[PDB]
Nucleic acid binder design. Structure first.
Ligand code: MG
Ligand code: MG
Ligand code: MG
Ligand code: MG
Ligand code: MG
Ligand code: MG
Ligand code: MG
Ligand code: MG
Ligand code: MG
Ligand code: MG
Ligand code: MG
Ligand code: MG
Ligand code: MG
Ligand code: MG
Ligand code: MG
Ligand code: MG
Ligand code: MG
Ligand code: MG
Ligand code: MG
Ligand code: MG
Ligand code: MG
Ligand code: MG
Ligand code: MG
Ligand code: MG
Ligand code: MG
Ligand code: MG
Ligand code: MG
Ligand code: MG
Ligand code: MG
Ligand code: MG
Ligand code: MG
Ligand code: MG
Ligand code: MG
Ligand code: MG
Ligand code: MG
Ligand code: MG
Ligand code: MG
Ligand code: MG
Ligand code: MG
Ligand code: MG
Ligand code: MG
Ligand code: MG
Ligand code: MG
Ligand code: MG
Ligand code: MG
Ligand code: MG
Ligand code: MG
Ligand code: MG
Ligand code: MG
Ligand code: MG
Ligand code: MG
Ligand code: MG
Ligand code: MG
Ligand code: MG
Ligand code: MG
Ligand code: MG
Ligand code: MG
Ligand code: MG
Ligand code: MG
Ligand code: MG
Ligand code: MG
Ligand code: MG
Ligand code: MG
Ligand code: MG
Ligand code: MG
Ligand code: MG
Ligand code: MG
Ligand code: MG
Ligand code: MG
Ligand code: MG
Ligand code: MG
Ligand code: MG
Lengths: 25, 94
RNA sequence: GAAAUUGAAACCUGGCGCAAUAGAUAUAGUACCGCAAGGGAAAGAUGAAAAAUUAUAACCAAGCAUAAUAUAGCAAGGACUAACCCCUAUACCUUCUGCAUAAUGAAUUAACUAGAAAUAACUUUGCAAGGAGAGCCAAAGCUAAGACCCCCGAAACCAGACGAGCUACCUAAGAACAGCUAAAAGAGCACACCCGUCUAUGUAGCAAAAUAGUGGGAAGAUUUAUAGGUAGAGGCGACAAACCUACCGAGCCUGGUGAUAGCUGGUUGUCCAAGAUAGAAUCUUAGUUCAACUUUAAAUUUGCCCACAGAACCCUCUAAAUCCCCUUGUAAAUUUAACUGUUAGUCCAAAGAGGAACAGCUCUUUGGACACUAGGAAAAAACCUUGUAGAGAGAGUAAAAAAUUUAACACCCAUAGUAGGCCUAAAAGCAGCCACCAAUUAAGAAAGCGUUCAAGCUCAACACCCACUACCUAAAAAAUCCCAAACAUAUAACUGAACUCCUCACACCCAAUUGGACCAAUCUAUCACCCUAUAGAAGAACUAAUGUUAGUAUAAGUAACAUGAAAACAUUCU
RNA sequence: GCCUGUUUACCAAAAACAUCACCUCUAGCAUCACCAGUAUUAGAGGCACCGCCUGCCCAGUGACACAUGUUUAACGGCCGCGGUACCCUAACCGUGCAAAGGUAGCAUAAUCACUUGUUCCUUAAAUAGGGACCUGUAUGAAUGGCUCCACGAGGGUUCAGCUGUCUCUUACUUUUAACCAGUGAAAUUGACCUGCCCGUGAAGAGGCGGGCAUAACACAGCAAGACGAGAAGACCCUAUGGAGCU
RNA sequence: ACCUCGGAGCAGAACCCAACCUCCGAGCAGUACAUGCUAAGACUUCACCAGUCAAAGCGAACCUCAAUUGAUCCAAUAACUUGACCAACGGAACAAGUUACCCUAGGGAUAACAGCGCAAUCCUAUUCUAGAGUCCAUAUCAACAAUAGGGUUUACGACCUCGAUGUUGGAUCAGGACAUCCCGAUGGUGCAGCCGCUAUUAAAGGUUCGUUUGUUCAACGAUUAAAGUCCUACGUGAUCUGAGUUCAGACCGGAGUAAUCCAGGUCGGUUUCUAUCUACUUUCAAAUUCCUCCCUGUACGAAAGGACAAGAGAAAUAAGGCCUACUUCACAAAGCGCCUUCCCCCGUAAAUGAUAUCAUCUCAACUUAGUAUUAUACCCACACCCACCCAAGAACAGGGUU
């Protein structure tokens, strides 16, 4: 388990990624 | 050639899964259905202050019926007819 | 673990046990092992007439030919007119969160082997203020019946007996040592002899310690034939914890003993239902006891989001939330008695810590997922969908496919007041100071390179035409060999689960655990005798424990292996 | 290490145990070994010849006298700092302790890491070997220190001459090797219709996904893999399971 | 480092929650004993053992602080009471050190070598420039500043592996990769020519002869273009050796009363498997390079010196064959003797041209070195087969028998 803030970007969750991809500008 | 570290779904360096078009359309239609539900759930009827006790009688009757059904548990009746007709195992041509 | 106390009916011949892996080990304490005590195992099947050596009674397991192979793949399923060809699909039980994993066990067949039981509990007869075949209990009790709690595997200790025939020591009588140099010698080389420093051969061999020399001694602290003695809380020891009958930091046999052991493994037929872990204590985290949850039948009524309202803080912020909560959706919530088990679990997201703002690392809280089914993401253990089960060659759905590719430039044009002011020799437009002037159209006492002090080149400013005069920057290379293939151009729809529906009735997919119903070989009583039922008892079931015994395949017709030649078989040759 | 010898029978045969020389303590003595012996004897202990020698201590232990003591060749121990002329190693003095503050000798050694030490030689090339030095703060005088007459299946190096260990292997015979005749194993086996690459999984796939690969069946040699065969690992850890020593 | 308990944040607004997370402490105290006796109702350190508040009455005049502590049994006293630093504080009434002479039931839950995820430790390639290189960042070096790849090595955790993963080298055998020493091809230079550096493409090969220390480490003598790196179980023990590293003996020095022990040193210390399965058994071949001779003593410097390129001749490694001439020694087979080995590999230098009427080598349409090659030789007759021979050969198979 990693922390909330890291340097390697850290890929988000699948649902969060889907939400960010469907709610773009 | 490209090797993935320990488990491509958990850990640090993981294989990233992306989104296509079917998932986007599904999310769009689900958000539309949920917005329709929000719109249909934006209008009451009694405004809370008009239901202090309208169907409490039915709930009380149902609770009394459940109590009467749960407190009426008893072993079934025992008759002699079974013990008498059990003797028909060794029945001949009578 | 008693005692005092009422008390305790002479005589009758079987097995609701078995038939050679059972029952005594037994046909027998036989073979075999050691000098010794002692340990110690399978055996025998035709028949009335074997003085019927006849023709038959065959048919079932593991191993074989009859009758080998025919491409592809945990050996299986779906199937069609035909074995393969088409699609799907990662052996079995276990310590483990997760095992076919390259962890544990297994070659099969046949026989045997593993839940034995009290106080307190549950159910059903009988009697009843009494029950009970003396004794005990009793403010609805007493008696009886049913129901229940494994196996195997160590090093250690004592008691009774045995060993110095190999080896340690001692005692009495004997034997052994060519030859040469023999300096007089616990002298040298060297036969036989005592021991074995090294090489080579084999480690299921000749051998549970061998083969040749290179080796030391070989007139003495040497070796050996015979007989006796020193034995475990000990013997012996030129001391190696060396030896004491092939396994002595402490022997063999028997009894304690089926010793104990938080430690390993295994634990036998079917269906259905319920069923997943806030913690504390312990010379304890590999265990145990109590919390919490799970299992049955009863008694009571309230269990969950509930709402206006309620839950001091202080300097500086103080979030997402929580606690009591009649309505509404619900049928569940507490207690009674017996109780087994969880109490050695992970990942993801959120709120924190150690660590490197590292880990598939650890410590707390909440939710989800897994050790229960399927589908998609390539195979998947934490990503998404989805939960209560079939037959049918039915239908409708959930999740379900990645796009990026870009670095250009202006066409021409430049005289002078001066070497504007100063340490260094001078820095004359780029070493520092305030003011950084001034001429014709128009150019900076200097906006970018080459200059100890000067020359060489552009740009801004006229003269001259006058495109965009710039979406700002955002790419990488390790070791067997890179990986499915393809299409920028016939119209957004379609495909797609165990989710839902169609005819049926619906108990027929969680770890440990608990509850309810059937099933079969034995004997006994009751009916039938071409084989089943009602009741009582069990030595009542084996795909597994490097489980015991007997048969037999792969390994494998694999390694090892014999006998000197001719011959009248009277002989001859190395 | 005095020597010969012996010790771990069955992985170490040695510097390991013993041996004459030396030193310490105890005993006034007749029947069963000691011993049919008498303080030139016997028993209990340490090193182990010959040459130079063994310097100190009873505060602590034991032993002997109970007279406060003796014993160390009985158990064990023999300093630190400051002032100290140009450079280390100091002459000397002061200070506190105590039995003495390392005596002789020897060496960077079988000797804590610094240590491949200065330097000479043996080789053209030497942490290998020998020679003169101790800051050896952890050598050291019977837990004895060193040369020396002889010796060692003990541990290391080298000179004149030679052996295919190699450059670079080869010529032959036997055992053995390949086939024929038979007895005929042992370990081991869940079943196999048993190929390769990339990627994944309990983290190293012939049985999982995508690709490549494919008529079937024996003989003769090598090891790359099947984490292959033999020992419930002797190394690390647990056990209120043991045993040996002090 | 700790063994009991309390407080402050983690745990923020009812409650509970741990760490070998960071801090204050406590084993008590300054003053009267009505600090007398009974008795409704509650909290309860997540169980129990324990602790705390209190209605009211009889009795009497009119309690402060946060942890602040001790149970069963037994002992002292006629009685009310009292006794442990039982600190291992839910507390056996009293037990130390070692086993490398060890045993047993187990654990990769919990280890030494490995394989595994990031990387505390590095290189490579760049953004920008403080400082050096005579002026001068990019010929080159590089810090205070940033981005991408990896584990060479030491370490983080022990995820299949204690019913067994053999551990450092060397001999033999090699495979892959460049972060390239070289021969192949470029541009610049603080490149005057042979000596050097920077950046790119290319792996068809070599990476020596020796010593001693135990070495993969490390030290020194002689060459060319080099004595390159990493991974392959820190490659390879069913192929080979242990020089140490993992035992039982002993010696020196040290700790320790002794026993015992040493990442301080030394002497020697058994190395076992008949190939079951996959896979292999010439892939037939088109090499590489050093030196010398006229040019060469020429460009170059002030002098040393020496090439770029071409032609010719002699030579080293590997592969394909031979016995007739040298050797092993003989109706045969090998090397020490002899013959041959033939083609490249992508980075620039330059005309015309518009987009952008100049210029422009082109991830535009094209022209030159600028792609060798769609290369060439072994070997390709279906069957006569008892037996004999053979330069052919394990059997089989291969050739001859006129
Ligand atoms: Mg992986
Ligand atoms: Mg009596
Ligand atoms: Mg019997
Ligand atoms: Mg028997
Ligand atoms: Mg059969
Ligand atoms: Mg198939
Ligand atoms: Mg089973
Ligand atoms: Mg187990
Ligand atoms: Mg595990
Ligand atoms: Mg297995
Ligand atoms: Mg295991
Ligand atoms: Mg097995
Ligand atoms: Mg004897
Ligand atoms: Mg002896
Ligand atoms: Mg003699
Ligand atoms: Mg002799
Ligand atoms: Mg000894
Ligand atoms: Mg037992
Ligand atoms: Mg335990
Ligand atoms: Mg974890
Ligand atoms: Mg863990
Ligand atoms: Mg000018
Ligand atoms: Mg469908
Ligand atoms: Mg359904
Ligand atoms: Mg269920
Ligand atoms: Mg039985
Ligand atoms: Mg049974
Ligand atoms: Mg069976
Ligand atoms: Mg076995
Ligand atoms: Mg069995
Ligand atoms: Mg074979
Ligand atoms: Mg043979
Ligand atoms: Mg013979
Ligand atoms: Mg000797
Ligand atoms: Mg021996
Ligand atoms: Mg002997
Ligand atoms: Mg020996
Ligand atoms: Mg001695
Ligand atoms: Mg002395
Ligand atoms: Mg030393
Ligand atoms: Mg040598
Ligand atoms: Mg000797
Ligand atoms: Mg044969
Ligand atoms: Mg799996
Ligand atoms: Mg693989
Ligand atoms: Mg396998
Ligand atoms: Mg074990
Ligand atoms: Mg314990
Ligand atoms: Mg014990
Ligand atoms: Mg005991
Ligand atoms: Mg004992
Ligand atoms: Mg409580
Ligand atoms: Mg009061
Ligand atoms: Mg305790
Ligand atoms: Mg405690
Ligand atoms: Mg030892
Ligand atoms: Mg010993
Ligand atoms: Mg063991
Ligand atoms: Mg490791
Ligand atoms: Mg500068
Ligand atoms: Mg582990
Ligand atoms: Mg292991
Ligand atoms: Mg195994
Ligand atoms: Mg093995
Ligand atoms: Mg390159
Ligand atoms: Mg050499
Ligand atoms: Mg290795
Ligand atoms: Mg191997
Ligand atoms: Mg071997
Ligand atoms: Mg030896
Ligand atoms: Mg074969
Ligand atoms: Mg195989």
């Amino acid at each position: 388990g990693s922390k909330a803030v890291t340097r390697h970007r850290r890929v988000m969750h699948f649902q969060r990624q889907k939400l960010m991809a469907v709610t773009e500008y | 050639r490209g090797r993935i570290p320990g488990r491509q779904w958990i850990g640090k360096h993981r294989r990233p899964r992306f989104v296509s078009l079917r998932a986007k359309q599904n999310m769009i239609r689900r958000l539309e259905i949920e917005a329709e539900n929000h719109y249909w759930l934006s209008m009451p009827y009694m405004t809370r202050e008009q239901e202090r006790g309208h169907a409490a009688v039915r709930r009380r009757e149902a609770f009394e019926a459940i109590k009467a059904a749960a407190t009426s548990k008893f072993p079934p009746h025992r008759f002699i007819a079974d013990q008498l007709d059990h003797l028909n195992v060794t029945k001949k041509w009578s």
